[PDB]
């Protein structure tokens, strides 16, 4: 079945990362977690929140890595919009890592993320 | 003494708009408004809802361009860090801006703000 984008929904990316959107209210200010599965990396399998807005397709979510188990001093901002492709849903995204003590714009870190509905 | 990224706080960009930070919770969640004033845009001079995180000097903010006078179809998303520079606080941001209904993430905008401490 054909995911939309819904609270309670849930995205894997191509790191095998999943974003849980938890909560989408009235306004389409959403709560979630992600968990990182990026292999080699820190921060991994372990939830941390999300907060975010939804506004039609166009959807921004960010999460602090900082949870109760491990820090990764920094800070991820996605932006992205879902799209139906090949009878699957997708949320397509730009995404910006800062890091805690910074001292340069390019420092900011940037790449790409599509995750795929998944349940 | 130089401003903070605290609760309170309000931070003003190279095009006059607003950032006005109301609570930062003791997980550095964040909640504001924000009011554009860039010559030429939609969406001017009415209080948009922020959300987002602070790590330390790291943060993220975004906004969803809806609120019950204007709707801009987009959210804006912002990356940064914060510096202190003779005694004045200021928070060097990229952002990424997206809209409803885009297709492909070269349809996504991004540019770069300053936003530096205001009373």
Same sequence: chains 1, 2.
Avoid: H
């Avoid at 819904?6 to 977690?33: C, F, H, K, P, R």
């Avoid at 807005?53 to 979510?61: E, K, N, Q």
């Avoid at 901002?77 to 997708?90: A, L, M, V």
């Avoid at 910006?96 to 910074?102: F, M, P």
């Amino acid at each position: 079945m054909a995911q939309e984008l819904t609270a309670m929904s849930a995205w894997v990316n191509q790191d095998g990362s999943t974003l849980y959107i938890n909560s989408i209210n009235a306004q389409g200010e959403l709560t979630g977690s992600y968990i990182n599965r990026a292999a080699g990396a820190a921060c991994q399998n372990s939830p941390y929140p999300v907060n975010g807005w939804v506004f039609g397709t166009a959807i921004s979510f960010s999460t602090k890595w900082l949870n109760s188990v491990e820090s990764c001093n920094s800070i991820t901002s996605w932006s992205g919009f879902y799209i139906n492709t090949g009878g699957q849903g997708k949320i397509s995204t730009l995404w910006q890592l800062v890091v805690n003590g910074s001292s340069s714009p390019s420092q900011i870190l940037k790449g790409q993320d599509v995750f795929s509905q998944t349940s």
